[model samples]
Target: QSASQFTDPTTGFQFTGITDPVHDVTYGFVFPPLATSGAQSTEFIGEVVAPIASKWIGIALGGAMNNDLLLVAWANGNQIVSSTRWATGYVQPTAYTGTATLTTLPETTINSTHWKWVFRCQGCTEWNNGGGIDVTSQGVLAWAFSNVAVDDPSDPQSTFSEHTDFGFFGIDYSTAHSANYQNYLN
Candidate 1:
């Protein structure tokens, strides 16, 4: 599939140019590389909504973020994912064994308590996380979705709910925000 007109088979949202979708979800990346579990994983970042309980972003190697690597960031009042707990990955795997990369400082300017996050494997050099990959290949499909969330009294924004639940729902979902997704293809 042409990267210009590419769309995820699952969520049907375009990534490159028209990022705003009818649904509240992050744009999944259709990487033009052959990813394997024996290579170095790449780094990625995106525009995130303000923090709350579920306001975090995730990366999925499969059809949904639930099935693979799920990097996340949050900006909630409870300090769910901050220096206290680092906006980290929800489902970090053993195959991708390495140190977690997270810029745990919350930029208090945008979101009250939550901040944009950064995560990666230290000394990483793999495709699916170990094997080197082919960038010119057809499709190593990856996708992410926008989430809508509310305050999880049982769960603090400073702590993870055993998963990275980022999207439209996680932020203070009183209405729509101008935030969107930024996907990287390398």
Candidate 2:
């Protein structure tokens, strides 16, 4: 996957990630100003725009699937339901109890052909479970999605099948900064 920068036309915040041209999926992160003295910020904005045919999509913050923080999202009726999970092995992950948290933004949308999720994530770059993303430089992440829907669409924690497609990507957080980050968070 090729890493690059993308500026959101509606929010004007810049995102940096691998934009997969083949699957029509764009997943990445946007950040606020660095902390004092150019340190990594405690929070950030993440988004995933995928084809409507995708039933569920997941992001692994620490690259591989196991032993990392996972953010899984799916469409449920008019709203998007997401969960924080952790996988010890290769099986389906369990609900995560880490300090990291995610708040879905109002900009999340689902239309005829595509579904998008924009969220504000706190404590994501630094996980309490001894896992963290080097936000100041390049970070390896993993993504997975399935075409089959979960057993229960109304529940974020419902059982889901294995990914039909999955892969790893590198994101350069050094270029993900937003000049006007507050506007997008509001």
Candidate 3:
């Protein structure tokens, strides 16, 4: 009796071993570590493209920000999942937002569920006029999809998706405007 034999309730998919095939995944975000003197704004964008012939997938996120976090998900370049106000309020510099999507994945569809999207700033403080946010220290944005559809709107049970973790480090306002983070999917 091995734990690997257990099946995921959301997708009704079973995990054979530690190594499993993960669907396409991508992530990107802006890091503001230090406060700025004037007003400034920025945007973080990311996208996920399904493999050649993969279906039934899901996505989730885990990370923190200085100001607020706005998430959006898409299927085949179409808006499917969206978060009204994912996360807000920064204290202790260790806040996180659970996994959310703009749209749901297709469980019983012939075509795979490929997601393409981006994250933008609804309203942020400026960097020059004593209006700047600091997202320094450490932060991350991870996304994963599996062949198995685990509790997705489209499929109540189906195993065929992938998952992974994407991490990033906040950049100092005095150093640079923006810095490139790590992309685990590629």
Candidate 1 lDDT by residue in tens digits, 83-132: 11211244432233344343432322345533333222222123333433
lDDT tens digits by residue: candidate 2, 43-83: 88888988888889999889989988899999876789999
The TM-score between candidate 1 and the true structure equals 0.37
Q: What is the lDDT of candidate 3?
A: 0.30
On TM-score, the candidate that comes out on top is 2
Mind giving the per-residue lDDT tens digits that candidate 3 earns over 26-132? 22233332345754333222333345233322222233333434332323223333332232343222112432223323421223433433333333222223423
Which candidate, 1 or 2, would have the higher TM-score against the true structure?
2
lDDT of each: 0.32, 0.83, 0.30
Worst 10 residues of 3 by lDDT: 177-186
Candidate 2 Cα errors over 4 Å, as ranges: 36-39
Ranking by lDDT: 2, 1, 3
RMSD, one per candidate, in order: 11.3, 1.5, 13.6
Q: What is the lDDT of residue 45 in candidate 2?
A: 88
